[PDB]
Structure formats: C-alpha cells, structure tokens
Design a protein around this ligand. Structure first.
Ligand SMILES: Nc1ncnc2c1ncn2[C@@H]1O[C@H](COP(=O)(O)OP(=O)(O)O)[C@@H](O)[C@H]1O
Ligand SMILES: Nc1ncnc2c1ncn2[C@@H]1O[C@H](COP(=O)(O)OP(=O)(O)O)[C@@H](O)[C@H]1O
Ligand SMILES: Nc1ncnc2c1ncn2[C@@H]1O[C@H](COP(=O)(O)OP(=O)(O)O)[C@@H](O)[C@H]1O
Ligand SMILES: Nc1ncnc2c1ncn2[C@@H]1O[C@H](COP(=O)(O)OP(=O)(O)O)[C@@H](O)[C@H]1O
Lengths: 744, 744
C-alpha cells in the first residue's frame, strides 16, 4: 500500500553486472540465457536506453576466448554509460532496417600529434574485421590499442531516422573536442540517486521550480505569485552547491553560477558590472535559474558595513532583487552558512522570502551518502556501511567523502608499498585487485576530524517504547497529549478546548525522564532537540541569554519537533537551592524561555518537554496554566517494573539462560533505572577482563553478576524519596473532593 | 442612523455574476429577466460604467447554444473591466443614434510576426457576421480564436460624441502598444476596496493630500500651512508601498517613486544628481507627489555615519527638504521599518513633521485582506475566511498573500499530480475545476512562518463584560473613571478636579485582574497594550531599562489606548520579596515607569492599569496621589459569583442540561477563577478521550465532571487570604470616622 505504487522492479529484462578483467573493446562476450529467455534479436545498432538514453552499442558473437556464462566488459563503465547504481536499463532491439550513410568522427588528442597524411590507411582501415562499429547519434565509444583515451559527442543532428552504419566513408576533422566539464555536468544531473540525507529538502525545493519552469502558462492563468528567492542553509560541507546544480540540471534550465569571492575580487566598479550583466543575460535565456555560491561574502551587512565599495555592491544586489517585476521566468537562489550572517534587507518579501534549511544528515541519511562515493570502487565481502553510518554522527556530506578517500589511500600503502618498483607505468593488475576492508575504515575514522560537532543535533531518536523498562502508566499519558491534537484537530475545536503546550517531568534522578521524551518523538516521527544542563548554564555564566531565541527558531521551522530541557533546575542549584541567594527563583535564562514560550503559536506542532530532579526549586512562574499544565511524576520501579529494565538493557549482550533475572530484581529494592544499568555495565566488563586474561568463553555466565554485586550503588536513598512524596500530595490536595456525587 | 447615509444598495439595476465555461467572445448569452424588469433597450454601443467608467460592450441575442436563464461570459473578467468585488455597476442605454466613422486599432504582438500584405482579407474581413464589434473610446475588448492575448487602449481623442461604429474602414499600424505596468497601475488605484486593516491610517493620510492637491486655491486664502512630509511606519510587509501608490493614483497626481537602494547603488557623485533632478522634475509637473521607498537605506544617520559619500547624500536630502519654500504643490512621503533607524534631523519641522504609524492588522482587519487575494479564484462551499483570520494573529499583509499562494499551490499537486501528462499545452478544463478547500489552508497555516511575532500586539480585545463571571461591584468602578472624563470633560473642569491617571488591581492570583483590564478597553473601544511579567524581567536582567520609553511612546500616539502591567511586582519577587536584598523596593524598571508616568500629559486619553498578586512588596512610591490613586481589591468569588463563572466558561462547550452548575458551585468554596477554568478544561479532555477510544457521544454528560473532580486544585489557600485581609484594613483605617455627622 505505502510502497505499492513504487513497484517497477522484477522485470525479466535484466542483466548481470560484474567487475572487468579484459580491456579489449573489439572482443565482447556473449550471453546465452539472455538470448533465450528474452526477445533480443540480432542487429548492428540496437535502440537501448536506461540512463538519459545514453548507452553503448557493440557487436556480439565474439566469445569463446576467456570464459562462458559470465560476460566481460571494459572498465570504462565507471564513468561512461553509467552514473550510479539503482538505475534501470531498458533494451529493445529494432531489427530489419536498411544501411545508413555514416556517423561523423570527433578527434580528441590523437589527431594533433603526428602526421595525418590520409587518416584512413594509418590506423583506421586495418582495424575493421567482422565489426562495423555501430555508432548512434550521441553515444560514447572507446576503442584503442594503447593509451586508451578518446571521447565522442556530436552536436549536429543531420539524420532523423535510425539505420545501420557502414565503413569506407568520407570524414573530416572539423569537430569541437569537448572538455571535462561537459562530461561532469551530465553526472551532476541528480534527482535523488546521488543525494543522501536530503529527502525532505529536495521535496520542498523541487516543487518550487518544477511548475514555474516546466509550466510557465500555469501561474499566468491562476492568481498565484511564484517565489523569486530561495535561500539555502547548512554548515559548510553539507552540499548546498551540489543540490542547487542537480536541481538546475534536472529541470533543464539556463544555469548561471555566480561565485561569491569571484565578484568581490574584481577592481573598483568592475564588480558593479559583473552582477548587472548576469541578470540581463538570464533574461534573454529564459527560463533560467541563478545561483549565488557565497551570499554572506557579498552582502554581510549585519555589523561589518565598512567601505564605500562593498556597500555599493550590497545596494546594487538589493536593487537587482526587487526590480525583477515578472519580465522573465528567472529564479534567484543563494547559499550561506549561518542565518545570522545575512543582510536583513534580503529577508524581506520579493527578495528572499523562502528559506530552506539543509541540516546534518542522520544515521539513515549518512548511510545513503556512503553508497554514493563508494560505487566507483569495489569493497571486500566483510565491508558493511551500516556500522560506519552509526559510528559517524558528527560528519557532513563532505566529511564522509574525505573519510572514503582516506580509507582508499590506507589500502594503497599497505598492500602496494611492498612492491618497491618505482615505474612510471605501473601494472593494471594491482589497482583493480586493491580491496578496501574494515581495517582501513577503522583507522580512517580514528584519524578523521569531524567538522559538525558544535552544531545542535536535530534527528529522530532510534529508541522506542520497548527500551523503557516498565512504567506503563505514563506511556498512555504522553500518547494522549501530543498525538490527539495532530490526528483529530476537529475534536479539540468542537469542544473549544485548547491542547496543552508542554509537560514537566519531575522525580528522582536516573529513572527514565529522557527515554520517555525520546520514545514519544520516535513514535510521532518528529524531530528531537535536547538541551542539556551545561547548555543552560553556559548561557547564564556568559551573561548571554539571547541564545535561547535560536533554540525556538530552529524548532518551529523544523516542524513537527519536540523540545526537551534536561535538568531545567540546573541554574537554581548553581546559585544555591534550598537556601539560595537573596533573591527568589527567577533568572535570565528561564525568563527568556518563558518569553519565547508565551509567544509560540499553538497551531504549529512544536511540543516542549521539561525534566527536573528538584521540583522544590522550580520557578512557580513556569507552571501557570498555559506553559506547563501537566506534571508527571516518575517513581522508582517496583518489583513489576525492574524485571523489564533488565530485559531491555541486556538485549545487546549475550546473556545465558542460566541467569535468573526475577530473583535479581527481587533483592534490588532501592535501585533506580540508572542504578541497574551500571550493574550490567560492570558485569559485562568482567567478561571482557576474563576473556583477555584467558587469551594468553563467548557467553557471560552467572558468576560475573554475583561478582559485580559487591559494588552495588544506590544513588537514590530513602531520605530523598520523602520530599517527593510530600511534594506530590502538596500539588494534589484532593481531600474531601473524593466523594463528590451529584444529588439528581 | 450610523450606516443610514451609506445606503446605495438595493437598486433594481443589477445582474448575476458567475464563473465561466465558454471562451468565445462572439457568442454572448441573453438574459430574459433583465430585458423585462429593467429598461435596457436595444443598441450597438451602450454607455455603461461602474468602475472608472471602464466596461466592455458586446452584441447580444446570440443565445440558444449552451443554456437558458444563466448568462455566460469570458474568463477575462478577472483582470479586465473589473478590479475587485464590492464595486457597483451602472448601465444606461443610449439608443436612437446615428452611425459613426470608426475607432482605431492597436496591434500588440500579432502584427509583427507574419506577413501583413493587406491586413484586411487575412483575418479581419472573414470574422464579421451579424456583429459590428461596437468599440468605445478607451474600452478593452479581447476576441481571438486561439492564443487569445490582445489589448486595446487609445490616447488620441478624435471624436467628441458617441455613435455606432461600422466595419469596412481604413486603419493603420501607427499605434503604441501598452506594456503591463500601464495595466497594473490602474489596479493600484485603491480607495479602500483593496486595502484591509488600515481604515484609520487611510482616514488620516488621505485628508492630508485631498485638500492641498484637489483644491490648491484653498490654503492660498486661509492662513494654514499644509504638511510637507508624511512618514509611514510598520514592519516590513505591512503594505507601506501599496498605500502610498493607491493614494497617489486615487488623487490623480504626478507620482515619482524614488527607491532606496536604487540611489545608493550609483557611482560616486551620480546619486547626488538623481536626487537633485527628481524634485525639479516634480516642480514642473505640479501638482506632484514624491515617495521614498527606503528612507533608512538613504539616511541612516543615527550611529553609522561612515564615509564621505553617504553623509553627502544625507546632507543633500536635508538641503532638498527644507528648501521647498512653497514653490509648487509637492508633498514628499517616505516609508521605513522602525522609528529608531531614522536621522533625527528629518524629525524636525518642515521636513517630516507628520508621522503615520501603520500597525499589524487585527482579527477584523486580516479578514478583509483575505478577501483581496482570494477574489481572482473561487473557493469551495466549505471554505470560510472567518476562522483563518482568527487563527493567524502574527501575520502581516504580505504573510496572508503568501499563505494564499501556498494554499493554492497545495491543491495543484494533490488533484492534478495524478494526471501524469507532461504536455506543454495543458487542458483548460482542469485549472478552472481546481477548488481550494479547508484542508489546503490547514497545511498552509502549519507550514507558514509568521514574521510579526516579536512585535507588541496592539489591538482591541474581543472579550466583553459577559465573559467576566460575577464581580458586579467593580464593573461600575471602572466605568466611572475612564468613561466620564472622555464623555463629559466639562464636568471635571467645572469643579476643578483632575481625573485619576491610573488604577492598581491587587488580590489573590487567578481572579480576573486581566479580564477587567481587557473588558473596559473593549467597552471604551480603545487599544490595549499588555506588558507581561517576563517582559519587565527582560529589561531588568539585561540592564536595559531604556526600553520602557517605547512602551509609552507607542501608547500615546495610538490614542485612545490603555496600558496594562501584568504582575507589576514580578521584579520584587525575583530579588527576594518579604526578606529581599539589602535594599528597599526600588529598581531601574519601576523607576523609569514612574519617570515616564509623571511626564505623561493628562489631557490625552492614555489610561494605565496595574495588576499585582503581592501588594506587600509593591513600592509605596507608585501609590502617591497622581500616579495610582485608586486601589481595587478583587476577592475570591462567593456563592453568588461562581455560578456566573461556569455559565461564562462553558459557552464554547456543548454541555448538556443535565449538569447542575448550582450544586457544582456550592461545594467549590476555596476556588478562584483560574481554579474553576482548569476543571472545565480537564472535563472537556475526558470527552475527547472517550470519543477517540469509542471510535475504534457528541455531547458531554455529567460523569466527566464527576471524574475530573478527583483532580481538584486549590491554588489559593486560607493562609494567603489572611494577609490580604490584614492589608485591606491597613490601607483603609476608617475607625471612628464612620459616625461623622455635622451638627447644623
Ligand atoms: N548530500 C550529499 N550527497 C553527496 N555528496 C555530498 C553531500 N553533501 C556533501 N557532499 C560532498 O561534499 C562535496 C562538497 O560539497 P559542497 O557542494 O561544497 O557543499 P558546500 O558548498 O555547501 O560546502 C561534494 O562534492 C560532495 O561530494
Ligand atoms: N525504564 C527504564 N528503561 C531503561 N533504562 C532506564 C529506565 N530508567 C532508567 N534507565 C537508565 O537510565 C539512563 C538514563 O535515563 P534518564 O531517564 O536520562 O535518567 P534521568 O531521567 O534521571 O536523567 C538510561 O541510559 C537508562 O538505561
Ligand atoms: N493592507 C494590505 N492590503 C493588501 N495587501 C497588502 C497589505 N499589506 C501588505 N500587503 C501585501 O504585501 C505586498 C506589498 O508589500 P509592501 O507593502 O510593498 O511591503 P512594504 O510595506 O515593506 O513595502 C502586496 O502584494 C500586498 O498584497
Ligand atoms: N470572573 C471571572 N470570569 C471569567 N473567568 C475568570 C474570572 N476570574 C478568573 N477567570 C479565569 O482566570 C483566567 C485568568 O484570569 P486573570 O484575571 O488573568 O487572573 P489574574 O488576575 O490572577 O491574572 C481566565 O482564563 C479566566 O477564565
């Protein structure tokens, strides 16, 4: 149902794909099962497609040289007639045609060097033997007995139909050899295949340019204003340029890149003309798309504003932004590293009204990126990218590419360094045999410095309700406040009641106040932003409470999202607590939190969860009806609950069936959730210690649990429970109102 | 009486307006009831008007093709012969005339492309069949069997009278094709129809330019100086440019737009001439109006003042501001985003003395804006804009336009995306059938980020005296201090007494101290500015008490207005309270509040209301006679009052008649106003929970009230009442003076 519409696979028209061992283009293997199961007939020029309708046509029935069944092709498939994996191939033979005239020839480098003379008898005639070299009208074929570097691309479409080529014609050398950027631009045309971790961003960007470009006559009949400015965000290395180029090449529009420092490096007044001519050039080449690589490098008019040359550039950019009154179908796009480093004049309407934030990829997103830079080379059988994505959390789209490059380089000076043959022409049987293993990646991760550690991680937690031992009572509570308003908004407006905006978790430390916040976000399939105690203390020690604004601004744009404040009372303990200073309980950070919470629109799906260990020092100003109406108390696990905590924490450890967990939970009375986790950690440590000592077995037995028992820790005593008990009844006060029965 | 003078409706000369299904201009339907009830006679050219005297004249009696009764017209009415809804149409036939010569022809694009030859036999002669194409002297007619894009506008008025045109004449191609701005400028001519939420601003702006422009000889005989500079305010997106253009086009004066960055993007010294020539150009084109789009971008001489080029521009603007000694009837207008970002030299007299503040539209104002951008497209029957205006409070005039654009786009990729027919000529039977529903708006609101959240909301509260349960004693008190001085100023000056400047509300929290402040503003039909506790704490933590000045400056300009300070003692609790620090009760924020309150003119209708929960920590310096003379105590509701609180909070919830509210209020003794509201909220939550559980009924029954009773909360105990009781008698002290009788 969900993925039923995406069914395009399990088609009989498929073929096997392997590595290459042969470098001869004139000798092509023959496949037996394909000629029997399928309907592929005989023919010189076959009309096949699959990737931008660009494949290679070769003559077959030249087998019985190397091997049977398995087919062998050249190693040019890495770049030619193939962009990446996952692309389908459609082959449909078109036999019984007549013989055409010929196709032209495009010299590359082999014609300039060397005497021409006649160009036929030199190396063209003595190369035809039962092979007419079928050439299409834009295909790329590579055949040469040696240096092997030749391309082919035509631009003049003389013949309309398809026929069979023939040798012994008249050719010339009046072609235009294409350079490498014309080949790379084809590879940049990416819809989703070579973009990882940016599914949502593409779904929002492509919809803004699909309609106004491919259907210009759509908005001309309906009173809708298409967007003019699209601003992209993300830390440097995310891939803001790659996405912009891929969308432009996919839509097929005139793309004019405007680099940041390229304009700013010009003379006095010349940069005033480079910007001016760029837009008028795109006007005549309509439809067109315009992208600015570095926008903060052109107009950083926030605090800097120095000099009479750069302000003039900013004013020119502003004038050329609101002055595009329709005219042509051109969309201006730009990229920057930080929302703060932008001219506020560009944030208005008509210049850059649509903002697209491209965040750091999550564990699932980073997995897809690894498959993009590792498709041109093969890997060992014991190489999995699933653990690599999990082990790299602070990496961006370029950090993974650098990691792959370093992993590939490690294998070079570990297997090839022993050859000790300094030759300018190294044998090709070594590079192809180079296989990158897990050991290369282990060193590469250890030597790679991530560039996305300070950024707030905004992902979807992988923890679910099964990882929370027991505590079944509050699971229904959380599902009844954040899921109901998002599934049935009509019911809340029917009664006139407004849904709650937040819930506060109070109780003894180490009981699950964070697992509850993460599991509900996992179930709701929403983002999760965690604010730690040290994060709050940093903004209080530095006298910078204005940083709370970005916390809420990042959250409301990334809707739906939940916002979690761990140990919200961390500042109250720092300034005292039960005694405290000469003031009450009201600081700058919580004041700003309240100010931003009051101003939040209740319609948007942004839920706030607060956690605390000392409810006695919580400011009562946060519990007024409207900010945190619901208070949930998490008690210590009972006999019923501690059993599930062990069954959840031991899923990753091979614990034998001999161990009795029910008896284990019985004696552990004054133990919280965190108390039971360290017991398992110390027990698992003993197994590792015993294994290492016995090296000079794979399962943990019962004795390790008994030995780790001597170091039991009870972080929650009976004294601190008493205040929670007396505080719960203080907030409850339901005496006398228990028996409230209406007379009639 | 109030709206009796505005009666222009219920005229028999009306017609039905519907959608379009036909695209043929030569075939026009015929209306039977209009030819019977009205006096519309037969004629080729009919003298009709209704919107700038611009309509279309067509020949009728070509019906009996599609349908009867209902008439069908072309889809050009969206832009031609119509600007917006609410405009009246007057049709008066003028029959029995003679045949005129002809009207000229204006080519647009169909004459340049293609051979002309004779231009008559090609496509002009074989298109006349019982239709002479009646053409007026400035009408716009569109008829073409195909691409359908042609305009018509004459500028040469050769014939004075009106006659009947005839074909078979001599024409030429020496006309000037008009471009799109000449068509858009007509649509910009808006009095009130296409401006929403700016009734008061237009009433103040149009009166400043109506007299000096339309009646130049008025101020020449009376010793009155007309204004020269009008400054407009508002956050970006409010519509400062649209209002300025609409007034200029309505008054019919030479309008010369001067953009901000347009001047600042010029070379060294060129911008000195662009400004200079603009005023002398307007001098000869008198009367004229001059508008500056970005004034802060030209003269931000407040702190920046860097460079010898921009200061010269500021000095030139200043010189060309006070140097307009009458000369011609030109008025210079400008717009900016913030009062702080302006050169104080422009605030003097003779340059910009009149300041017009254009605020964010209220709920009523935003409703009118939605009807402006949704008039060119039809909506579904279940589409109401009343709830959209209420649900969007932080939106500006452009945020609503963007919201409408996004709502229109959502319907495109939800109903049309299933066609899967990528054709350059999409069928016209799909776009017209596209109906935007509530579901599109629900997603559009959730995905739209408002740009007016940080701005202080200054509106008129919708709450009235009926929403305040009981508390009849103080309702008369508030009506006797803020309404008497504004209705009978003579009575106060007769006795020499000066009216009070403010009233302080003290009592237990959650009793109605805010509803009382809002209801009196609602009854007085005045603005309401609310200052929350966190707002006061922000200016105390940041050591920035100078922000209190804008609070009073925004208030006195927006007269009449009331100013409300919620929990005025919020800073006293933050620095201690009953014990406090080593000082008394005097901080920077309250000191600045007193300084600004003393300096306020008592003549202007600006009333200040203070609210507090801890009167024991209130600075006595604010209760001196002259700042807050009157102190009103709000006690807990008694048996008489709690009944009305329930009857007011349950008006939005379908509560059955089974529930006994009188018995409900009887047992609830120590419950305040806020205590009873959460009971209703939790009870309404149970109905939603039960409905959702029973999905896998519409009325709330009595059992939910009984079940929610177990979670009763008494935020106000008996201990805190005692201090209020002992404080009221402390401030009263009326012992011995109860029996004061004059002897004789
Ligand atoms: N989402 C991604 N998918 C694939 N490659 C990526 C991605 N993000 C970054 N990269 C890699 O990073 C390199 C540089 O990215 P770049 O376009 O420079 O981003 P930016 O310019 O915003 O820093 C690209 O060549 C690409 O290989
Ligand atoms: N019900 C539970 N299920 C699983 N782990 C728990 C549970 N309660 C506590 N823990 C352990 O406590 C650790 C931290 O949990 P957390 O809720 O953050 O404690 P606290 O709420 O005191 O911060 C987790 O790593 C988890 O193993
Ligand atoms: N009061 C209003 N009525 C109608 N449209 C408005 C209003 N305010 C803003 N807009 C919309 O905003 C757009 C123009 O914004 P504008 O007023 O130019 O911004 P600024 O005021 O900063 O120049 C118009 O398309 C208009 O529809
Ligand atoms: N007399 C009353 N009528 C209606 N609602 C009341 C009344 N008293 C208190 N409330 C409820 O209390 C809430 C806030 O009242 P408010 O006056 O702000 O309390 P406080 O004065 O303590 O701030 C409102 O939601 C309102 O419904």
């Amino acid at each position: 149902l969900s993925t039923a519409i995406l069914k395009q696979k399990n088609r009989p028209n498929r073929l096997i794909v392997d590595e290459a061992i042969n470098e001869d283009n004139s000798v092509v293997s023959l496949s037996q099962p394909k000629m029997d199961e399928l309907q592929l007939f005989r023919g010189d020029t076959v009309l096949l497609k699959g990737k931008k309708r660009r494949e290679a046509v070769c003559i077959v029935l030249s087998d019985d040289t190397c091997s049977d069944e398995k087919i062998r092709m050249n190693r040019v498939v890495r770049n030619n007639l193939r962009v990446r994996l996952g692309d389908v191939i459609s082959i449909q033979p078109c036999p019984d045609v007549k013989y055409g005239k010929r196709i032209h020839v495009l010299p590359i480098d082999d014609t300039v060097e060397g005497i021409t003379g006649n160009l036929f008898e030199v190396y063209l005639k003595p190369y035809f033997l039962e092979a007419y070299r079928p050439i299409r009208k834009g295909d790329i074929f590579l055949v040469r007995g040696g240096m092997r570097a030749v391309e082919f691309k035509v631009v003049e479409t003389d013949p309309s139909p398809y026929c069979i080529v023939a040798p012994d014609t008249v050719i010339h050398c009046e072609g235009e050899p294409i350079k490498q950027e014309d080949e790379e631009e084809s590879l940049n045309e990416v819809g989703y295949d070579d973009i990882g971790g940016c599914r949502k961003q593409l779904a929002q960007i492509k919809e803004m340019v699909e309609l106004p470009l491919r259907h210009p006559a759509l908005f001309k009949a309906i009173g809708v204003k298409p967007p003019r400015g699209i601003l992209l965000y993300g830390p440097p290395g995310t891939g803001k340029t790659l996405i912009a180029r891929a969308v432009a090449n996919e839509t097929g529009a005139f793309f004019f890149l405007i680099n940041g420092p390229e304009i700013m490096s010009k003379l006095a007044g010349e940069s005033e003309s480079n910007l001016r001519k760029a837009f008028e050039e795109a006007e005549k080449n309509a439809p067109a798309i315009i992208f600015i690589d570095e926008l903060d490098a052109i107009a950083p008019k926030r605090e800097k504003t120095h000099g009479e040359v750069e302000r003039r550039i900013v004013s020119q950019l502003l004038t050329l932004m609101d002055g595009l009154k329709q005219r042509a179908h051109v969309i201006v796009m730009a990229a920057t590293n930080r929302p703060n480093s932008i001219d506020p004049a560009l944030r208005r309407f008509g210049r850059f009204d649509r903002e697209v934030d491209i965040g750091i990829p999550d564990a699932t997103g980073r997995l897809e990126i690894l498959q993009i830079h590792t498709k041109n080379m093969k890997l060992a059988d014991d190489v999995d990218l699933e653990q690599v994505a999990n082990e790299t959390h602070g990496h961006v789209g370029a950090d993974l590419a650098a990691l792959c490059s370093e992993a590939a380089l490690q294998a070079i000076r570990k297997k090839m360094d022993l050859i000790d043959l300094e030759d300018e022409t190294i044998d090709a049987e070594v590079m192809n045999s180079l296989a990158v293993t897990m050991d290369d990646f282990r060193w590469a991760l250890s030597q790679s410095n991530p560039s996305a550690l300070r950024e707030t991680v905004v992902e979807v937690p992988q923890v679910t309700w099964e990882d929370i031992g027991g505590l079944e009572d509050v699971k229904r509570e959380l599902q009844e406040l954040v899921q109901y308003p998002v599934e049935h908004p009509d019911k809340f407006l029917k009664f006139g009641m407004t849904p709650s905006k937040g819930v506060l978790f109070y109780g003894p430390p180490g009981c699950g106040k964070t697992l509850l916040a993460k599991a509900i976000a996992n179930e709701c399939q929403a983002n999760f932003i965690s604010i730690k105690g040290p994060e709050l203390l940093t903004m209080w020690f530095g006298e910078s409470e204005a940083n709370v604004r970005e916390i809420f601004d990042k959250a409301r744009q990334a809707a739906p999202c939940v916002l979690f404040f761990d140990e919200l009372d961390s500042i109250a303990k720092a300034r005292g607590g039960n005694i405290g200073d000469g003031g009450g309980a009201a600081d700058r950070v919580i004041n700003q939190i309240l100010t931003e919470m009051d101003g939040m629109s209740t319609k948007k799906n942004v839920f706030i969860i607060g956690a605390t260990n000392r409810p006695d020092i919580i400011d009562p100003a946060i519990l007024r009806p409207g900010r945190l109406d619901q208070l949930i108390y998490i008690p210590l696990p009972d006999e019923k609950s501690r059993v599930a905590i062990l069954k959840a924490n031991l899923r990753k450890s091979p614990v034998a069936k001999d161990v009795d967990l029910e008896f284990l939970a019985k004696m552990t009375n004054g133990f919280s959730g965190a108390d039971l986790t360290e017991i398992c950690q110390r027990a698992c440590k003993l197994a590792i210690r015993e294994s290492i000592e016995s090296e000079i077995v794979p399962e943990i037995r019962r004795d390790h649990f008994e030995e780790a028992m001597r170091f039991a820790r009870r972080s929650v005593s009976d004294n601190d429970i008493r205040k929670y008990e007396m505080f719960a009844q203080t907030l409850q006060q339901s005496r006398g109102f228990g028996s409230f029965r209406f007379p009639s």
